Amino acid sequence: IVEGSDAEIGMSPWQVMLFRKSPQELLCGASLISDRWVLTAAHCLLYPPWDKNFTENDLLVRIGKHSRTRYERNIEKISMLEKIYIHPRYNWRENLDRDIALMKLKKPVAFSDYIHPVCLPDRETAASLLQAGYKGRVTGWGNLKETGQPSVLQVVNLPIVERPVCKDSTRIRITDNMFCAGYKPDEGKRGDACEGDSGGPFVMKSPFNNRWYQMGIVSWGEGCDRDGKYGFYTHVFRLKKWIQKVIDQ
């Protein structure tokens, strides 16, 4: 996260860290959607251009975390993956269309003050909240700059941007399965997700029922926090039928 701030304790209790066993490192962000399911970006697990093809045994999910590097004894819970499910129409060749994956945990995680699932939006939540100007919140332990690393979880609030402005900012083809967010150069304010924030959640707090909903997944960009550029996010509601099918089994 570039130009964000340190998270408060328990601010994002659905925040998940995808952690590589060997070498011991940050693989990606992710989110907790139930006691047994974790949502992430497909590119966190499958990305042929960079020879990335992780299997269940390659990683661990660390839940309830705040510090990036420390082992948070009596706070964080470490879970193993039973199975990974990548969207069958995930487009890693061109624009990361349908950049979404599910991970089933081997055992259910216990909820606590620091561990709690986020909601997934229904049609009405998405129609009411996914509007240009409406702000969401992105969290992660990724890069503080495009070209170090944070000590604790970072947070940034960013406005959803008009589809024509998203389209006009890039040469990459944009689809209905993604949306873009961030400030314009005229807005003064800054902020973006960056490398290492991938797979993390873009959340909004419904003013109707006061619950947090995951509207997006950190997916891609072209550099980080550049003027005239915006961060791109997987549109969660657009892919909810796939999510529901996988969880129903």
Partner: peptide, 10 residues
């Protein structure tokens, strides 16, 4: 620069 996690997690 990551702190070692308990052995039980593999």
């Amino acid at each position: 620069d990551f702190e070692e996690i308990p052995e039980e997690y593999l």
